[model samples]
Target: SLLEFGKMILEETGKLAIPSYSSYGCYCGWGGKGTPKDATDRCCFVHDCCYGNLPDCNPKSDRYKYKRVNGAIVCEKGTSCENRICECDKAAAICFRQNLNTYSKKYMLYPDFLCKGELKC
Candidate 1:
């Protein structure tokens, strides 16, 4: 959700966006396993941590869902849990965009080891 917004920002400029650097680059989806590959990856890492901070919210929680509203996605229509998750993702998306300049094709392949993870293969 939030990272997608970051992609939109990247597209608005003159750059492209990828879902993840790689398996080792860090998780671009929900949760991550080890070190973050870069600032974007660290953004995801912070997102996961944010989810953990809220009550009854976690990376695996099913409290994340937004409906399109007024030309934007609204995290409303749910409890406070959903709100926090939405805000968390929103922050991460901005983080991704802030560090867009650090991304490179070099991280597209594995073995960089900037992010070390055994949970992913």
Candidate 2:
């Protein structure tokens, strides 16, 4: 099932010019809290780093060694974005391009539907 979903997401993501990045629980859903891991939910092209509260981690830490699949980078857990830390897991924040604009709009939207829906999708 993961392979199938990954294949589909990767194909579409490639077409959209959306670089694919995978992480576990990067969004944490609205009120939810947790960190992304390398098992089960290892890689996610969508919703990666889209959530604001997810802790940022150092890319070279042993905790994220598994995230460095294919000799790629890994995003360390427990760090914040304000620190400007480098992440080996470059895919840690693939949707950042639109996330910045959307994050600013979170305050103006009613019922939080706009931001919520956008982030979920």
Candidate 3:
């Protein structure tokens, strides 16, 4: 669907081209430290709605592995089992939103401007 959308946009604008590296699906993970400033620690995922928000989780972090199980956030057991675990509401929004904002500002054009109309998704 992203490919189709990209093609449609290209056809309409005829001025913009999709980057070769672009791909569909969630873009979530730690951006390594240094250069471009905002690359470090970012996570982007889709929930009921698309979320590009705060508290990113590094695969290497001590935080438990967070998985979407039947549309729910589930955290696996860890050494610090009693410590705070990832909660969808907190991690998906509060933590993810901030990091996503940083990444989006640095590397993306707003979809609203690109689409030239309100996007249903």
Every candidate's lDDT: 0.56, 0.30, 0.31
- Candidate 1: tens digits of C-alpha lDDT, residues 11-98: 4333444435323255555336666767766766676677668767653445455555664445565667667767676566556667
lDDT of 2 by residue, 22-117 (tens): 221333123322332222122332333432224553222323212344543343454354122323123333333223333322222123222222
TM-scores of the candidates are: 0.56, 0.21, 0.23
Ranking by TM-score: 1, 3, 2
What TM-score does structure 3 among the candidates reach? 0.23
The CA lDDT at 83 in model 1 is 70
Question: Candidate 3 at 49: error in angstroms?
Answer: 24
lDDT of 1 at 17: 45
Clashes of 1: 0
lDDT (C-alpha) at residue 119 in model 2? 31
**In candidate 3, which residue ranges exceed 4 Å CA deviation?**
1-60, 81-85, 88-90, 93-121
lDDT of 2: 0.30
Error of 2 at 39 (Å): 23
The residue pairs found clashing in candidate 1 are none
The 10-residue segment with the lowest total lDDT in model 2 = 105-114
RMSD of each: 5.9, 13.2, 14.4
Task: State the TM-score for model 1.
Answer: 0.56
